[PDB]
From Swiss-Prot, chain A:
The modification Phosphothreonine is found at residue 31. It comes from Homo sapiens. It is found in: Nucleus. This is 116 kDa U5 small nuclear ribonucleoprotein component. It is linked to Mandibulofacial dysostosis with microcephaly: A rare syndrome characterized by progressive microcephaly, midface and malar hypoplasia, micrognathia, microtia, dysplastic ears, preauricular skin tags, significant developmental delay, and speech delay. Many patients have major sequelae, including choanal atresia that results in respiratory difficulties, conductive hearing loss, and cleft palate. There is a cross-link at residue 9 (Glycyl lysine isopeptide (Lys-Gly) (interchain with G-Cter in SUMO1)). There is a cross-link at residue 9 (Glycyl lysine isopeptide (Lys-Gly) (interchain with G-Cter in SUMO2)).
UniProtKB/Swiss-Prot annotation, chain B:
The lineage of its organism: Eukaryota, Metazoa, Chordata, Craniata, Vertebrata. It is found in: Nucleus; Nucleus speckle. It comes from Homo sapiens (Human). It is linked to Retinitis pigmentosa 13: A retinal dystrophy belonging to the group of pigmentary retinopathies. Retinitis pigmentosa is characterized by retinal pigment deposits visible on fundus examination and primary loss of rod photoreceptor cells followed by secondary loss of cone photoreceptors. Patients typically have night vision blindness and loss of midperipheral visual field. As their condition progresses, they lose their far peripheral visual field and eventually central vision as well. Widely expressed. The MPN (JAB/Mov34) domain mediates interaction with TSSC4 and SNRNP200. Has structural similarity with deubiquitinating enzymes, but lacks the residues that would bind the catalytic metal ion. Contains a region with structural similarity to reverse transcriptase, presenting the classical thumb, fingers and palm architecture, but lacks enzyme activity, since the essential metal-binding residues are not conserved. This is Pre-mRNA-processing-splicing factor 8.
Curated annotation (Swiss-Prot), chain C:
Keywords: Acetylation, mRNA processing, mRNA splicing, Nucleus, Phosphoprotein, Repeat, Spliceosome, WD repeat. The chain holds residues 184 to 500 of 514 of the full protein. The modification Phosphoserine is found at residues 18, 208. Belongs to the WD repeat PRL1/PRL2 family. Its main location: nucleus. It comes from the Eukaryota. Involved in pre-mRNA splicing as component of the spliceosome. Component of the PRP19-CDC5L complex that forms an integral part of the spliceosome and is required for activating pre-mRNA splicing. As a component of the minor spliceosome, involved in the splicing of U12-type introns in pre-mRNAs. This is Pleiotropic regulator 1.
From Swiss-Prot, chain D:
Belongs to the CWC15 family. It comes from the Eukaryota. GO terms for cellular component: catalytic step 2 spliceosome; mitochondrion; nuclear speck; nucleoplasm; nucleus; Prp19 complex; spliceosomal complex; U2-type catalytic step 2 spliceosome. InterPro entries: Cwf_Cwc_15. Keywords: Acetylation, Coiled coil, mRNA processing, mRNA splicing, Nucleus, Phosphoprotein, Spliceosome. PANTHER family: CELL CYCLE CONTROL PROTEIN CWF15 (PTHR12718), SPLICEOSOME-ASSOCIATED PROTEIN CWC15 HOMOLOG (PTHR12718:SF2). GO terms for molecular function: RNA binding. The modification N6-acetyllysine is found at residue 16. It is found in: Nucleus. This is Spliceosome-associated protein CWC15 homolog.
Length: 43, 55, 317, 118
């Protein structure tokens, strides 16, 4: 029952602090690259 | 280098806090395997460097 | 019991968006509820899908902390400001900066778009507001007269067209045409860091750590005084149903009635897992155009999204 | 002394555009040239304010919320060796799902310090 240093879980889970009703969305890198635009021109 | 030493102080503290990781059964396994290997090869253990060592 | 307030349903969290690498200092909603912007301390403006809570686009270009972000309702534009001293205009058609508005001396803290003239009005730490022409990138006027940093600005089409609170505890109601002060409201004891305009009733409120004050627009008449939420409040926002929201630097957020000023809900939300107990704090909040979501921009580098509770009355004072 | 903080900033209103345009200076930068001299306006399909006025936003938002929630739901020999199978039930242990608000303890930082220090 030894926990290695590489594991070492600090900081309890986001599902455990907000609960089952709050849906946590970790958003890193993104859909639609920077050439694909916001509001489209009239083509 | 400063961020590395922050992580390294963290790691040394966690080693002194969380015990060995080595799990003494496993260390006895490692030690016993090394003992059986050294006795299998008839290894002669290195002495202290003698007072009249010619080399 | 002098008034009886309207019954407002309680608000509850349902979504915690995460992904900024700095304090989220501003937020704004697009006019068609398709997406919302945030600006943050990690020098990125992030476009988020409003319905799904998913990162739509990440725009870079500020050299320092992004302080304000607003979306234009008339033109297909995105205005932003930073601690960079810079005021940018983003063409959303191209996702590229096309215009920078130059002339502020220190960090730009806020901005508001005039709703009908194409005029941008910014505040800075240099104790001035400025009035920019969007098309010619020129300072029309320099609203000077505050003595400390200037925290916030709101614009109208009706009279006083420009309203600002500042860190010298005063509020100045200005004339956009002349460029001079019309009313000085000194009622607050600490720095006015939030003002909010009502959609219908031709009043405005303003917030500071002592208490929040409501006010009639032409000459700043005192109407009321809403107290109980005692922390450094960063933003105020209003729902057309008369819900005032007052969020503060301790992370607390109190939900108020506009008309009577009754505190019906206190939401002291929990921080993100890695976050620190002293890092709870709100910097910005916005209603969506449906006015049924509440977007808060938190000091634990998250966005929190709230909605009204469909479990009816459990309430009434 | 020489090395000192500020404790008061500079106040705007006394230079180049501030009161009389520095008494109408004939000095101008390259960045002050005519550029983007035409405001674009929102068209009928973009989000023009006439198109945004009649709309009921809550119903459309609830529809988009419903579709997004439905999409997220529909997505998801030498037997004589001194150590047996040590990794028995370790199914990769989802550290790469957690987001942690600590720059020394993010999974990004652990990968960073593992990758760039030898």
């Amino acid at each position: 029952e030894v926990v290695l240093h590489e594991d070492k879980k600090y900081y309890p889970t986001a599902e455990e602090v907000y609960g089952p009703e709050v849906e946590t969305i970790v958003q890193e890198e993104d859909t639609q690259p920077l050439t694909e635009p916001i509001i489209k021109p009239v083509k | 280098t400063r961020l590395y030493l922050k992580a390294e102080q963290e790691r040394q503290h966690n080693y002194l806090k969380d015990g060995p990781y080595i799990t003494a059964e496993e260390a006895v396994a490692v030690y016993t395997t090394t003992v059986h290997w050294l006795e299998s090869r008839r290894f002669s253990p290195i002495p202290f460097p003698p007072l009249s060592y010619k080399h | 019991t002098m008034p009886k307030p309207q019954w407002h349903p309680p608000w509850k969290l349902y979504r915690v968006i995460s992904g900024h690498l700095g304090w989220v200092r501003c937020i704004a909603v697009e006019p068609g509820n398709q997406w919302f912007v945030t600006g943050s301390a990690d020098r990125t403006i992030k476009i988020w899908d409003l319905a799904s809570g998913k990162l739509k686009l990440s725009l870079t270009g500020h050299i320092s902390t992004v302080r304000g972000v607003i979306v234009s309702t008339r033109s297909p534009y995105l205005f932003s400001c930073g601690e960079d001293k810079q005021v940018k205009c983003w063409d959303l058609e191209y996702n590229k900066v096309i215009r920078h508005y130059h002339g502020h001396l220190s960090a730009v803290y806020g901005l508001d778009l005039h709703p009908t003239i194409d005029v941008l009005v910014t505040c800075s730490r240099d104790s001035t507001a400025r009035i920019w022409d969007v098309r010619t990138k020129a300072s029309v006027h320099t609203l000077s007269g505050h003595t400390n940093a200037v925290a916030t600005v709101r614009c109208q089409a009706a009279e006083p067209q420009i309203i600002t609170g500042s860190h010298d505890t005063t509020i100045r109601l200005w004339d956009l045409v002349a460029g001079k002060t019309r009313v000085t409201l000194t009622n607050h004891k600490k720095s006015v860091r939030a003002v909010v305009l009502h959609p219908r009733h031709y009043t405005f409120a303003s917030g500071s750590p002592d208490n929040i004050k409501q006010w009639k627009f032409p000459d700043g008449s005192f109407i009321q005084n809403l107290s109980g939420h005692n922390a450094i409040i960063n933003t105020l926002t209003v729902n057309s149903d008369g819900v005032l929201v007052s969020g503060a630097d301790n992370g607390t957020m109190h939900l108020w009635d506009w008309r009577t000023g009754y505190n019906f809900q206190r939401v002291h939300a929990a921080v993100q897992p890695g976050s620190l107990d002293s890092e709870s704090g709100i910097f910005a909040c916005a209603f969506d155009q449906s006015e049924s979501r509440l977007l808060t921009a938190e000091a634990d580098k998250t966005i929190k999204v709230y909605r009204e509770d469909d479990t009816a009355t459990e309430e009434t004072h | 002394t020489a090395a000192r903080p500020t404790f008061e900033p500079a106040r705007g209103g006394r230079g180049k555009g501030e009161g009389d345009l520095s008494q109408l200076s004939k000095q101008y930068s390259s960045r002050d040239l005519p550029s983007h001299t035409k405001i674009k306006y929102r068209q009928t399909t973009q989000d023009a304010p006439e198109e945004v006025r009649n709309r009921d936003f809550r119903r459309e938002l609830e529809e988009r919320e419903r579709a997004a929630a439905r999409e997220k739901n529909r997505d998801r020999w030498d037997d004589d060796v001194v150590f047996k199978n040590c990794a028995k039930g370790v199914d990769d242990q989802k550290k790469d799902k957690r987001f942690v608000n600590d720059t020394l303890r993010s999974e990004f930082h652990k990968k960073f310090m593992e990758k760039y220090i030898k």
